[PDB]
Design an enzyme around this catalytic site. Structure first.
Site, short mmCIF file in Angstrom:
data_model
loop_
_atom_site.label_atom_id
_atom_site.label_comp_id
_atom_site.label_asym_id
_atom_site.label_seq_id
_atom_site.Cartn_x
_atom_site.Cartn_y
_atom_site.Cartn_z
N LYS C 10 -41.10 15.18 22.31
CA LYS C 10 -41.46 16.60 22.45
C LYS C 10 -42.95 16.68 22.13
O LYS C 10 -43.48 15.81 21.44
CB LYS C 10 -40.66 17.47 21.49
N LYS C 15 -46.15 11.12 19.93
CA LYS C 15 -46.08 10.06 20.94
C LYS C 15 -47.49 9.43 21.20
O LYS C 15 -47.64 8.22 21.15
CB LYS C 15 -45.64 10.63 22.31
N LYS C 41 -52.40 16.47 28.13
CA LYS C 41 -53.20 16.64 26.94
C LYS C 41 -54.34 15.62 27.05
O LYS C 41 -55.48 15.96 26.75
CB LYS C 41 -52.38 16.44 25.66
N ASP C 129 -40.73 17.06 26.98
CA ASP C 129 -40.06 18.36 26.92
C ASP C 129 -39.24 18.86 28.10
O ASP C 129 -38.16 19.44 27.91
CB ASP C 129 -41.08 19.42 26.54
N1 LIG Z 1 -46.68 9.29 11.63
C1 LIG Z 1 -47.56 10.25 11.53
N2 LIG Z 1 -48.20 10.49 10.32
C2 LIG Z 1 -49.15 11.50 10.13
N3 LIG Z 1 -49.51 12.31 11.09
C3 LIG Z 1 -48.91 12.11 12.28
C4 LIG Z 1 -47.97 11.15 12.58
N4 LIG Z 1 -47.59 11.23 13.86
C5 LIG Z 1 -48.30 12.25 14.35
N5 LIG Z 1 -49.11 12.80 13.43
C6 LIG Z 1 -50.03 13.95 13.65
O1 LIG Z 1 -49.33 14.99 14.32
C7 LIG Z 1 -49.96 15.44 15.55
C8 LIG Z 1 -49.03 15.34 16.79
O2 LIG Z 1 -48.80 14.02 17.37
P1 LIG Z 1 -49.33 13.68 18.83
O3 LIG Z 1 -49.21 12.25 19.17
O4 LIG Z 1 -50.75 14.17 18.85
O5 LIG Z 1 -48.47 14.58 19.82
P2 LIG Z 1 -47.69 14.22 21.19
O6 LIG Z 1 -46.37 13.72 20.68
O7 LIG Z 1 -47.59 15.54 21.91
O8 LIG Z 1 -48.56 13.14 21.93
C9 LIG Z 1 -51.33 14.70 15.58
O9 LIG Z 1 -52.37 15.68 15.33
C10 LIG Z 1 -51.23 13.59 14.52
O10 LIG Z 1 -52.40 13.48 13.71
MG LIG Z 2 -49.94 13.62 24.64
#
Ligand SMILES: Nc1ncnc2c1ncn2[C@@H]1O[C@H](COP(=O)(O)OP(=O)(O)O)[C@@H](O)[C@H]1O
Ligand SMILES: [Mg+2]
Ligand SMILES: Nc1ncnc2c1ncn2[C@@H]1O[C@H](COP(=O)(O)OP(=O)(O)O)[C@@H](O)[C@H]1O
Ligand code: CLF
Ligand code: SF4
Ligand SMILES: [Ca+2]
Ligand SMILES: [Mg+2]
Lengths: 476, 522, 271, 275
Positions: C10, C15, C41, C129
Site C-alpha cells: 500500500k 516498498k 511517486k 493499492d
Molecule cells: N522500516 C522502516 N523504518 C523507518 N521508517 C520507515 C521504514 N519503512 C518506511 N519508512 C518511512 O516511511 C515512509 C513510507 O515508505 P515508502 O517506501 O516511502 O512508501 P511506499 O511504500 O509508498 O514506496 C518513508 O518516508 C520512510 O522514511
Molecule cells: Mg513508491
C-alpha cells in the site's frame, strides 16, 4: 550520376526546419548495389516527422486492413468510432469467393460504433452485446476478431477477457487484436500485432489433430493477399507443378486453411515484411522451413518455380520444367508485343513494403529501367534485399514526404510512376503517366505468367496513352 | 493462359475452366465450407420478415454504416479557404484514410497533414507534435493558413488545442500573426457533417471574434452563403451562378470548388481559389448569412446569430421546385434585388420537364439514404414529382430532423407509405428493401451491394441502385453534377426518369417474351 | 537463471524504502541488480542514487517526444554498489492510464537491452493499492516471477496484500507468477508479527522477514542514502541483510489462496 | 438545488468513516442525503447500513447478468436518518479497469432515477491513491461539483491530496468540478493542523476541519454503527456535526494550484517531520 543524385537530395532538404531536415537526410540515399548492409546507406522504420505529409497508414490498417480483413469466413469488428471501418471498407481488393453476408463477409463493415457514452463508460459491455448480436444475425460465420481502433488502448477497455469469455460461451474463436493506431509508427507494427494475434488465438487449434491426410508435396502460400486475384494466378502455377496448396495467407483465406497450415511441408513466403513473423514462429514450433519467392514477371517466376521445385523431388522438378515449357510461348509473345513499346522507359516507384523491390524484375522484363524506388514502412532487412535489385546510383527513399517526392520527380523526370492513390492525381496533373501499384489500378492480377500479360498491357496503355500528348494548349 | 490478342482481366479470366476447377478443389479440399443448400437456406432467411425483426432489434452492432467521422468533415471545410492547409492533430492513419476517401470520390488530389502522434505521444500529450508539426508544415507547404482539427486519440487523451497552438506561437515555432483556427472534432460525437460544422464555426470565430465593434451589419451589402459539407461541384457553382444572375453581391464561405477541380495543364496546384481571409474577416458586415444545409450547420447558426447578430432566415436546402423558389424569393428580400427573367425561365423549364416526365415518374417507390439535408431535400422533390418514397434513412440524423421530414411527408398525399428511420444502417435498409420492395434505391456506392443481394434472391426482387449522394466510387465524374436549384432538380429529374426507362427496357428486352412492350417511343 | 522479483504494497508503507535497502544489502553482497520503479511517486530509486529526483523514461521521452529516440544511458543510471536504477514514470493525473506507463517503460528496457545483461536480480517497485490491468501488467506479461508484498498490522496493508494476492491468482495459468513472501514493516503494533504470519498462513505463504521501526532509517533517508550504506554497524542495517539473505535463500513460490474479508475480520480480531 | 460531494484520499485515512459520519450528522440535521462508495472496499456504506457487507451493483448486475435487468429497490437500500446507501463496487482484480465499475454504477443510478429525488446532498467515497480515467471519471463527468480531500500528517496523504488537486485542474475547463476543502484526520502527529492548513494555503483551498483521533469511533464501528448515532452526546459526535455544518456553510470552491514534490517535501520539514 552519383554526385548529381547526392546534390539533388541535399538541394531538396534545404526547405525543412533542422530537426526534420536532420532526420530526413537519414532516409534518403543514392544506391550502391555493392553494399551488403542497408544501415550504412539508409535508416528506416522510425516515427515520421509531423506536418510533412507522409503516406503512411496506421497499425489498424496493417492489422485489420491487410492481414485479417481478407479472411473470408471470419467476421472482423472494427472496435472504436465509426470512421476507421468506413474509410477502409472494400478499399483493398483481396479477392475472395463466397456468398457475402451469409458465409463470407469481406466487403462488409462491422463496427462497435462508439459514441461518447462508450468512450466515457467504456466499450466491453457493448463488445459482448455486439458479439451476441453478431451471432444471431450471421449464423454461419466461422470466427470473430476484434480490431482495436485508437480509443480502445487509451480508454482502458479489456478486450481479451470479453473475447475469452464469449468465445468460451459461443464455443467460437474470437480473436482480440490490439492494433491501436497510436501503437507503432506505420502499417507495419499492425502486421506483427496481427501475426502474433493469429499465432496466439488461431494457429494451434489443430495442434493435436491428425485426421487431415497430408502428402509430402503440401505447401502454403504465405503473404499473398490475392489483390486482383494474384494469389489464384500464383496458386494455379504451384498446383500445375505438382505441389498441393493447403493454405493462402490471407487472401481468399479461410480460418480452416490457416489452422491446417502447420500440417504443410514447406511455407512459400511472397511478402516478407507482413508475415515473416509467423513464418519464423512456424519454423521454431513446427520445424516447417520457409522460403521467399517472387512471381512478378517471367524471369522471377521461372527462377522462383525452379527454387521451390528443388526443395522437392525430381518428379516435381520435372513437372516444373513442363510448366515453364507450357507458359514460355505465352510470356514471350507478350514480351514480343510489348517490349518494343516500353523499351528504355524510366520508372519511379513508391509503395509500402514488398512491392518496390519485387516488381523490378517485371519492369526489366519489359525493358523498362527503374530509376528510383522507395518504401512507405519497410524495415532495414527489406532495404538489404532492395539494393541488389536496384541499379547503381539510383535514388532510394524511406517514408518519403509528399514535397520530397514531387521535387525528386521533377528533377529525375521519369516516364512512368508507380505509386498509390494519394500520389496519383498530382502526377497526372503534372503530365507524367501514373499506374497505381497498390490496387493495380483496378486491373490485375499482376502475379504469375497470366498476371504478366495484364501487367505489360497495363504499363503500355497508360504509358503510351494519347492523352499525355494533349496537355499544353495549342495556343502556347 | 492468356491469348495475347485478347488479354483477360480478373473478370473473365477466373471464369476459365482451369481456374474454375482449381477454386473448386480449393473450396472442397481446404475451405470446409458449409453446404450450398445451407448457404441457400440462410440466405433466404435474411430476406424474411422474421430476420428483419431480429435485425431491427440490435442495440450494439452496426453493420454497413451510412455515416463517417468528424475530421473528414473538418478537412473538407478547411479545404474551402484560400492557401489553407487542413491540419489534423492526432494519429496519422486517419489522414491517410481521409485523403484516400476524398481522392476516390473527387478523383483529385487532396492535401492534408498530420502531426503524427504516437504511443509515447499518448502519455506526454500532443504538445511537441503540434509545435514541430506546425513548424514543419508551414516551412514545407507554404500554406497561408493552417486549420487544426483533431483525431479521436487526441480527443480521448484530452490535448488542449488552444493552449498547444498558443504555446507554439509563444515558443516561436510559428509566427504570432500566422492564422491557425482550430476546432475539436471528436469522432465519437456526431458525423462528418458535425465535424464540418465545428471546423467552420471555429474558422469564422477565429477571424471575427476579437473585432466586432468596427463591424456593422449590412454595411458591405453582400449575403454570406455557408455551403455546409458538400461533395458536388455543381452545387457551389449553381449557388454562385444564380446569385450572380440575380445581381446579388455575395460571399461564399468555404468554397472548395477551384481546388477540387484544378486542370491538368502540366503543373500541380496544391492550392486553388478558396474563401479569402479578408472575406472571412469582413463577413459580419453582410446584410445576412444564409446556410444552405441547416441541419448540420447548427453550431455555426449559433455563432452567427449570437456574435454577428445576423438573423439567419429559416430556409430548407434549396432542392426541388418549392425550396428553390423560397431561397430565391428570400435572397430577393434580403438583397433588395428582383428575381430576373432569366431565372424565372429556368423554373418554367423545370416545370415543363416535370409535366413531360410525370406519367413514368408517378407512383414510383423509392428507398433512399444520405446526410440529413440532402435526404430531406430529395424527399421533398420526389413528393413534388409524385413519386412515393417508401423507405427514408438517415444514419446521422436526429429526432428533430425526423419530426421535420414526417411533417413534409404528412403535407403530401404521396408520403403515405413513407417511413423515416434514423440511427439505422444499410444492413437495416437491406432488410427493408427485401420485406417491402421499392422500385428503386437512391444512394451512394455502398448500395451496390444491397442491389447485388436483391438480384440474388431473384431477378424480380432486385432493386436497382440510382446514385446520388456521397461517396460515389464506381462511376466517374458524377461529382461534377448539381443537386441544388432548378439545374439540380433538372439533373435529378432526368436521372430518375431515365433510370426508370432504362429498367423498363431491360425488362422488356426478351425476344418474343416481353418485347411486345419494348417500345421505340416512350 | 535470472530471477526478477517485484515489490508490492500500500502506499506509504515502505516498498521504495524496503526495496532499496534489500538491494543495497544484495549489492554489498556483490549481486548485480537493476531496480525499475513502476510507482508514479518515483522516489523508488532515490536512496541508492543519492539524487533528489530521478528523471523517468516518461519525463526524458516527453521532451525528446518519442520513445526509441531517447538514450538508454541518459535514462538508466548506475547507483551505489553498481546497482541499476530507473523510473518507469507515468501520465498526468486524469489522462490515459497510470499503469500503462509501467508497460512502455518495461518494453523500452527489454528493447534497449537492460535484461540479458547478466543481472542477478531485478526488482520492481510497484504501487499495490489498486489492482488494474495497467497496474497488474507486470503480473500479466511475466515481467516478474516472484512477488513480495509489504504488509503490516492495520486493515489497509492486509487488504491490499490480499488483493494483490487476488491478482496473482487470476493470472496463474498464463504466467509463472508466484507470491514470493510477505515482508512485514513495523507499525509498532502490539501483535503485528503473529498477525502477518497468521494472515500469511491462511494465504499459503510464510512471512519472509519482520522489519522493525528505526530512526536510523529516517536519518539515512534525509542524507539521501540507504541504511546499509549510512550505518553498516546498525541493527536495522543488519536486519535488511536478513531479508536480502532470506530472499536469496527463499525458494518458496506459491500460488495464493486469497482470503475472505471476514476471515480478515476474525483474524484482525484474533491478535 | 440538489448537491454532489466527493471524499477522495489515500486509503486507510478515514475517508469512509468521515464520510459516513458527516452524512449521519446531516441526517441528524435533516438534509435528505445519498451515499455512493466508489472505493472497491464497500465498507463505505457499512456504518450507516448496519450490514456487514453491502451487495453491489457490480455483484448484483452479475448472476443477473444484465445491468438494466437489475432492480433499484434491491440495489439501493435506505439507512439511518433515511439516507440512501449504495455501492458501486468493482471487478475481480487484474481484470478490466476498476474505476470503470464506478461509472456504470452512477449511470445506473442516474438512469434508474436516484437523483432529482430532492436529496439535499450526495456523497461519493472514492479511492484517492491513483488517478486515471476510470477514477477520474467522476471528475471528467460533472459527477461531483464539490470535492473534499481527507489527508493526514504523513507524506502519502499530502501526495494523494496534491495528486487529486492536479486532477481537478485538468478537468476545470470542461467541468464545474472544483475542490471544496481539505478535511483533516489526526494520526496524533506533532503539528497536523498547522501542516495541513499550510498545504491547503499552498493548494489554494481552505482546510475545512480538524478531526481528532479518538477511541470512540472504534467502539461505535465494531458495534457497526456511526458515532453520531451511537453517542449523540459524545465529543467526537460534536466534531462530526461541525464538519457537516462547515461543508453546508462553506461557499469556497476553488481550482487548485498544485505544489511541487519539493514544496510538499519542504513543507513537511518546515514543521519538522524531516530534518
Ligand atoms: N522500516 C522502516 N523504518 C523507518 N521508517 C520507515 C521504514 N519503512 C518506511 N519508512 C518511512 O516511511 C515512509 C513510507 O515508505 P515508502 O517506501 O516511502 O512508501 P511506499 O511504500 O509508498 O514506496 C518513508 O518516508 C520512510 O522514511
Ligand atoms: Mg513508491
Ligand atoms: N477521527 C478518527 N479517530 C480515530 N480513528 C479513526 C478516525 N477516523 C477514522 N478512524 C479509524 O481509522 C480507520 C480508517 O478509516 P476508513 O474509512 O476505514 O479508511 P479508508 O476510507 O481510508 O479506507 C478505521 O479503522 C477507523 O476506525
Ligand atoms: S489512427 Fe477512425 S478515422 Fe481516425 S479519428 Fe479515429 S475514428 Fe476517425 Fe488508425 S486507429 Fe483508426 S485509422 Fe486513424 S482512426 Fe485511429
Ligand atoms: S486500467 Fe486501472 S489504472 Fe488504468 S485507467 Fe483503468 S482503473 Fe485506472
Ligand atoms: Ca481529377
Ligand atoms: Mg473506506
Amino acid at each position: 550520376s552519383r554526385e548529381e543524385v547526392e546534390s539533388l537530395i541535399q538541394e531538396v532538404l534545404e526547405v525543412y526546419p533542422e530537426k526534420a531536415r536532420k532526420d530526413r537526410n537519414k532516409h534518403l540515399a543514392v544506391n550502391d548495389p555493392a553494399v551488403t548492409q542497408s544501415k550504412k546507406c539508409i535508416i528506416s522504420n522510425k516515427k515520421s516527422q509531423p506536418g510533412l505529409m507522409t503516406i503512411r497508414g496506421c497499425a489498424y490498417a496493417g492489422s485489420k486492413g491487410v492481414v485479417w480483413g481478407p479472411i473470408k469466413d471470419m467476421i472482423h469488428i472494427s472496435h472504436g468510432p465509426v470512421g476507421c471501418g468506413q474509410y477502409s471498407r472494400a478499399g483493398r481488393r483481396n479477392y475472395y469467393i463466397g456468398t457475402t453476408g451469409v458465409n463470407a463477409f469481406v466487403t462488409m463493415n462491422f463496427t462497435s460504433d462508439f459514441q461518447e457514452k462508450d468512450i466515457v463508460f467504456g466499450g466491453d459491455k457493448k463488445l459482448a452485446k455486439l458479439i451476441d448480436e453478431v451471432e444471431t444475425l450471421f449464423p454461419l460465420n466461422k470466427g470473430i476478431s476484434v480490431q482495436s481502433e485508437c480509443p480502445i488502448g487509451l480508454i482502458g477497455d479489456d478486450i481479451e477477457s470479453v473475447s475469452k469469455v464469449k468465445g468460451a460461451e459461443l464455443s467460437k474463436t474470437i480473436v482480440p487484436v490490439r492494433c491501436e493506431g497510436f501503437r507503432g509508427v506505420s502499417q507495419s507494427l499492425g502486421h506483427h500485432i496481427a501475426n502474433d494475434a493469429v499465432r496466439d488465438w488461431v494457429l494451434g487449434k489443430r495442434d493435436e489433430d491428425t485426421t487431415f491426410a497430408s502428402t509430402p508435396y503440401d505447401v502454403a502460400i504465405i503473404g499473398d493477399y490475392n489483390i486482383g486475384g494474384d494469389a489464384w494466378s500464383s496458386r494455379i502455377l504451384l498446383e500445375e507443378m505438382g505441389l498441393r496448396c493447403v493454405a493462402q495467407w490471407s487472401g481468399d483465406g479461410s480460418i480452416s486453411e490457416i489452422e491446417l497450415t502447420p500440417k504443410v511441408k514447406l511455407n512459400l513466403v511472397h511478402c516478407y515484411r507482413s508475415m515473416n513473423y509467423i513464418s519464423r514462429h512456424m519454423e521454431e514450433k513446427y520445424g516447417i522451413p520457409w522460403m521467399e519467392y517472387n512471381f512478378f514477371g517471367p524471369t522471377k517466376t521461372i527462377e522462383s518455380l525452379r527454387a521451390i521445385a528443388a526443395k522437392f523431388d525430381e518428379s516435381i522438378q520435372k513437372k516444373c520444367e513442363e510448366v515453364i515449357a507450357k507458359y514460355k510461348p505465352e510470356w514471350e509473345a507478350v514480351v514480343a508485343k510489348y517490349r518494343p513499346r516500353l523499351e528504355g522507359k524510366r520508372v519511379m516507384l513508391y509503395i509500402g513494403g514488398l512491392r518496390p523491390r519485387h516488381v523490378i524484375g517485371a519492369y526489366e522484363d519489359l525493358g523498362m529501367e527503374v530509376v528510383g524506388t522507395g518504401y512507405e514502412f519497410a524495415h532495414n532487412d527489406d532495404y538489404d534485399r532492395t539494393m541488389k535489385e536496384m541499379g547503381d546510383s539510383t535514388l532510394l527513399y524511406d517514408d518519403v514526404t509528399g514535397y520530397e517526392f514531387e521535387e525528386f520527380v521533377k528533377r529525375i523526370k521519369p516516364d512512368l510512376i508507380g505509386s498509390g492513390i494519394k500520389e496519383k492525381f498530382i502526377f497526372q496533373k503534372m503530365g507524367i503517366p501514373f499506374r497505381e501499384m497498390h490496387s493495380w489500378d483496378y486491373s490485375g492480377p499482376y502475379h504469375g505468367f497470366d498476371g504478366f500479360a495484364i501487367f505489360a498491357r497495363d504499363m503500355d496503355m497508360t504509358l503510351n496513352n494519347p492523352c499525355w500528348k494533349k496537355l499544353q494548349a495549342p495556343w502556347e | 493462359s492468356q491469348q495475347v490478342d485478347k488479354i483477360k482481366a480478373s473478370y473473365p479470366l477466373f471464369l476459365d475452366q482451369d481456374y474454375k476447377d482449381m477454386l473448386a478443389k480449393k473450396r472442397d479440399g481446404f475451405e470446409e465450407k458449409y453446404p450450398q443448400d445451407k448457404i441457400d437456406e440462410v440466405f433466404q432467411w435474411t430476406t424474411t420478415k422474421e430476420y428483419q425483426e431480429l435485425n431491427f432489434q440490435r442495440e450494439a452492432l452496426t453493420v454497413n454504416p451510412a455515416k463517417a467521422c468528424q475530421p473528414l468533415g473538418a478537412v473538407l471545410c478547411a479545404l474551402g479557404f484560400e492557401k489553407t492547409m487542413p491540419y489534423v492533430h492526432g494519429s496519422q492513419g486517419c489522414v491517410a484514410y481521409f485523403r484516400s476517401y476524398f481522392n476516390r470520390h473527387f478523383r483529385e488530389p487532396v492535401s492534408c497533414v498530420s502531426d503524427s502522434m504516437t504511443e509515447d505521444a499518448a502519455v506526454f500529450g500532443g504538445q511537441q507534435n503540434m509545435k514541430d508539426g506546425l513548424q514543419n508544415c508551414k516551412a514545407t507547404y507554404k500554406p497561408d493558413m493552417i486549420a487544426v482539427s483533431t483525431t479521436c486519440m487526441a480527443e480521448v487523451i484530452g490535448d488542449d488545442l488552444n493552449a498547444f497552438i498558443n504555446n507554439s506561437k509563444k515558443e516561436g515555432f510559428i509566427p504570432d500573426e500566422f492564422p491557425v483556427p482550430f476546432a475539436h472534432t471528436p469522432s465519437f460525437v456526431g458525423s462528418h457533417v458535425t465535424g464540418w460544422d465545428n471546423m467552420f464555426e471555429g474558422i469564422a470565430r477565429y477571424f471575427t471574434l476579437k473585432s466586432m465593434d468596427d463591424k456593422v451589419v449590412g454595411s458591405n451589402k453582400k449575403i454570406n452563403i455557408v455551403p455546409g459539407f458538400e461533395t458536388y461541384l455543381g452545387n457551389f457553382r449553381v449557388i454562385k451562378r444564380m446569385l450572380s444572375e440575380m445581381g446579388v453581391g455575395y460571399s461564399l464561405l468555404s468554397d472548395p470548388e477551384e481546388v477540387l477541380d484544378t486542370p491538368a495543364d502540366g503543373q500541380f496546384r496544391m492550392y486553388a481559389g478558396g474563401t479569402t481571409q479578408e472575406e472571412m474577416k469582413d463577413a459580419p458586415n453582410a446584410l445576412n448569412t444564409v446556410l444552405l444545409q441547416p441541419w448540420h450547420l447548427e453550431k455555426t447558426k449559433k455563432f452567427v446569430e449570437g456574435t454577428w447578430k445576423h438573423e439567419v432566415p429559416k430556409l430548407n436546402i434549396p432542392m426541388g421546385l418549392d425550396w428553390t423558389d423560397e431561397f430565391l424569393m428570400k435572397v430577393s428580400e434580403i438583397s433588395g434585388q428582383p428575381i430576373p427573367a432569366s431565372l424565372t425561365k429556368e423554373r418554367g423549364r423545370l416545370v415543363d420537364m416535370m409535366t413531360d416526365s410525370h406519367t413514368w415518374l408517378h407512383g414510383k417507390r423509392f428507398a433512399l439514404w444520405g446526410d440529413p439535408d440532402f435526404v430531406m431535400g430529395l424527399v421533398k422533390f420526389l413528393l413534388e414529382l409524385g413519386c412515393e418514397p417508401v423507405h427514408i434513412l438517415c444514419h446521422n440524423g436526429n429526432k428533430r430532423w425526423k419530426k421535420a421530414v414526417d411533417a413534409i411527408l404528412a403535407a403530401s398525399p404521396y408520403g403515405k407509405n413513407a417511413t423515416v428511420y434514423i440511427g439505422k444502417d444499410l444492413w437495416h435498409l437491406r432488410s427493408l428493401v427485401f420485406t417491402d420492395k421499392p422500385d428503386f434505391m437512391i444512394g451512394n456506392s455502398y448500395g451496390k451491394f444491397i442491389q447485388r443481394d436483391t438480384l440474388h434472391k431473384g431477378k424480380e426482387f432486385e432493386v436497382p441502385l440510382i446514385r446520388i449522394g456521397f461517396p460515389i466510387f464506381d462511376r466517374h465524374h458524377l461529382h461534377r453534377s448539381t443537386t441544388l436549384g432548378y439545374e439540380g432538380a433538372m439533373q435529378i429529374l432526368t436521372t430518375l426518369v431515365n433510370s426508370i426507362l432504362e429498367r423498363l427496357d431491360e425488362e422488356t428486352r426478351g425476344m418474343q417474351a416481353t418485347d411486345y412492350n419494348h417500345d421505340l417511343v416512350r | 537463471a535470472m530471477r526478477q522479483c517485484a515489490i508490492y504494497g500500500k502506499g506509504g508503507i515502505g516498498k521504495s524504502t524496503t526495496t532499496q535497502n534489500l538491494v543495497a544489502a544484495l549489492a554489498e553482497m556483490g549481486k548485480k541488480v537493476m531496480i525499475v520503479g513502476c510507482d508514479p511517486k518515483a522516489d523508488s530509486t532515490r536512496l541508492i542514487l543519492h539524487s533528489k529526483a530521478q528523471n523517468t523514461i516518461m519525463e526524458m521521452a516527453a521532451e525528446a517526444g518519442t520513445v526509441e529516440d531517447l538514450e538508454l544511458e541518459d535514462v538508466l543510471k548506475a547507483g551505489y554498489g553498481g546497482v541499476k536504477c530507473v523510473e518507469s514514470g507515468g501520465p498526468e493525473p486524469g489522462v490515459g492510464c497510470a499503469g500503462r506507463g509501467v508497460i512502455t517503460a518495461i518494453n523500452f528496457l527489454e528493447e534497449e537491452g537492460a535484461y540479458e545483461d547478466d543481472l542477478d536480480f531485478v526488482f520492481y517497485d510497484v504501487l499495490g493499492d489498486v489492482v488494474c490491468g495497467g497496474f497488474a501488467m507486470p503480473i500479466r506479461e511475466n515481467k516478474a516471477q516472484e512477488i513480495y508484498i509489504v504488509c503490516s498490522g492495520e486493515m489497509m496493508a492486509m487488504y491490499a496484500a490480499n488483493n494483490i494476492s487476488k491478482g496473482i491468482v487470476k493470472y496463474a495459468n498464463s504466467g509463472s507468477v508466484r507470491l514470493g513472501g510477505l515482508i512485514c514493516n513495523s507499525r509498532n503494533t502490539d501483535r503485528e508479527d503473529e498477525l502477518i504470519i497468521a494472515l500469511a498462513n491462511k494465504l499459503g505463504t510464510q512471512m519472509i522477514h519482520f522489519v522493525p521501526r528505526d530512526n536510523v532509517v529516517q536519518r539515512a533517508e534525509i542524507r539521501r542514502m540507504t541504511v546499509i550504506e549510512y550505518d553498516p554497524k546498525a541493527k536495522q542495517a543488519d536486519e535488511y541483510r536478513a531479508l536480502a539473505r532470506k530472499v536469496v535463500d527463499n525458494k518458496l513460490l506459491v500460488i495464493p489462496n486469497p482470503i475472505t474479508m471476514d476471515e480478515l475480520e476474525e483474524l484482525l480480531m484474533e491478535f
